[PDB]
Design a protein around this ligand. Structure first.
Ligand SMILES: *Cc1c(COP(=O)(O)O)cnc(C)c1O
Ligand SMILES: *Cc1c(COP(=O)(O)O)cnc(C)c1O
Ligand SMILES: [Cl-]
Ligand SMILES: [Cl-]
Lengths: 334, 334
């Protein structure tokens, strides 16, 4: 069983680190990005689901057969569904009734059971509250509580974090900076802890959609298209008085940016375009030659009837418009 | 440039090998499968596109900027689109006008240009013939000719083949057998060459849909749902008088089988369910305890409005019905 937990680490992590070179009005810059599609269900939330349940078993927090229950329509639902099944747990996912058939289908394909929450019945906030309710009534239940559970960010401190840190040292470079958009805060907290232990002067910045500057303002919640991040509150996991300044990207700018990365061979999700632009924002402010790291949480295959496959009206302040990708200068993997 | 070609090998291969244990009426059996979603565009045809173009540059068969042109709606289109862009070539894909918006979108997302071929204008056969025509008129053109190009199967002899062979020796096991469904024949020929060099008594069997026993009959072409394999002719690449007997799986049986693998945590495409069942057919005939290897070419995310997300009428001869997946007993990766 520690044999099982040991070998299954092999279905996650160890993803490519790419050096991307581009032209930014028009001087040549570069970003380093980890590509997280190279995982069991194609996102970074595989590293997190696996770890959450490995540690959970280690501390008797979950028993064989217990129901795993969470609120998402995104990769967390997917990651937990597939590892739940691998480890033999039932999985229940709670989500807003308005999710697309596309999403529901995927989560469902892994055995997980779908309970839709009306508008009304609380909506997204509803679904979170409905998970807690289920667990009061089924005490058996294991809740990942993805927005507050420390096991999430630890996942990234021990996993993608170590990886990032080493891949960069291996090019004899320091990390001057890291940016990641925040859904749960796990990535930016976990990786950011790890980067700071090795690169004491780096800047760890959390990313928010400029359309919904929840993190930078403390209250504002608005419609945005960057899936995976910036839900309608500040997750407990994320700790702003301990991070550097917040970066903010228009969802339009991001979409476009992800359009361009695909066009140069990297099919990614909208969040990945946001990170990229964020990473350049952070570069603009630390120095044209700083090393900036970010992540590409998933690939484009799920986003195929989203604004990602449509012309975006460009706007004056977008950075995407000034950016031209030249090449992939390097790929590491270890 | 041999620096570039060298580092980009890092965006493909080195995928997990899983030992799957299951119950087959009801005695316990096992299959080993390589999981090929863990690649740049999520399929096995990444290994092949990369290799085809690496060797092509090595032999001056393609020049910077030349247009890469091929006929597919599947992973080959996708793989070639994304590596073409990475390496700066234009890509044109020819496909039947009736392809779904879903497919077109994906191929397009990577920069590749879409020419649809009527029914009429030859259909699928049309599209192949239309690629040749384009290249008569644009002599510049690089054709992958995926159904006849030896560089395809070599890809798998040097790549997934080596990997398979070593991963199995590392468990102190011989390969008694391998099965792979045949679209181009690259997988089964390339891997099969490699397996035979190390496991001289293994059986290398090509897989066909029972609904369309083109390979076993020499002529029959019929409607089937297993995407990626058994188009409407026998590809030149595949060489039947040099392989073992053909296995044949109902597309319904396959679909179901892929339903079940997802439900146990492995989201796969229909072809992957076909391979699995094939692998068991081959096991039934060599001995309940033979080691059989097969491949899971891609994941389920593309197949999301296909018969994969619908109840299949079960039938007497299906093996899926008698199969119960217990667990993933092991995962290797090196
Ligand atoms: C979860 C997610 C994010 C954000 O990661 P957190 O660690 O949850 O902040 C970004 N993009 C996508 C696609 C995600 O699923
Ligand atoms: C191409 C493909 C196959 C068959 O592989 P060949 O080497 O072309 O025979 C099987 N499944 C899928 C999804 C494929 O794209
Ligand atoms: Cl700062
Ligand atoms: Cl035989």
């Amino acid at each position: 069983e520690q044999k099982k937990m040991k070998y299954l680490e092999n279905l996650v992590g160890k993803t490519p680190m790419l050096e991307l070179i581009f032209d930014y009005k028009g001087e040549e810059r570069r970003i380093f990005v980890k590509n997280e599609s190279y995982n069991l269900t194609g996102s970074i939330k595989d590293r997190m689901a696996f770890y959450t349940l490995k540690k959970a078993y280690e501390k008797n927090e979950i028993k064989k057969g217990a129901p795993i229950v969470e609120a998402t329509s995104g990769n967390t639902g997917i990651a937990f569904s597939a590892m739940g099944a691998i480890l033999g747990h039932p999985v229940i996912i709670y989500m807003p009734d308005w999710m697309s058939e596309e999403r529901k289908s995927l989560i469902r394909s892994f055995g997980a059971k779908i309970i839709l929450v009306s508008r009304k019945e609380g909506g997204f906030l509803g679904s979170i509250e409905k998970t807690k309710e289920f667990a009061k009534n089924n005490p058996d239940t294991y809740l990942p509580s993805q927005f507050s559970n420390l096991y999430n960010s630890e996942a990234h401190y021990y996993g993608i974090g170590l990886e990032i840190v080493n891949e960069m040292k291996s090019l004899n470079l320091n990390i001057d900076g890291f940016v990641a958009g925040v859904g749960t805060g796990g990535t930016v907290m976990g990786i950011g802890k790890r980067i700071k232990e090795n690169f004491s002067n780096a800047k760890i910045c959390p990313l928010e959609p400029l359309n919904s500057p929840t993190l930078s303002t403390g209250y504002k919640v608005a419609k945005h298209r960057i899936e995976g991040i910036s839900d309608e509150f500040i997750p407990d996991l994320v700790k702003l008085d301990k991070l550097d300044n917040v970066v903010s990207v228009d969802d339009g700018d991001a979409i476009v940016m992800a359009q361009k990365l695909a066009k140069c061979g990297l099919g990614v999700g909208i969040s990945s375009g946001a990170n990229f632009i964020g990473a350049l924002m952070l570069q603009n402010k630390l120095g044209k030659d700083s090393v900036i790291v970010t992540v590409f949480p998933d690939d484009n295959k799920k986003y195929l009837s989203t604004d990602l496959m449509r012309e975006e009206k460009v706007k004056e302040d977008f950075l995407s418009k000034d950016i031209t990708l030249k090449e992939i200068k390097n790929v590491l993997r270890v």
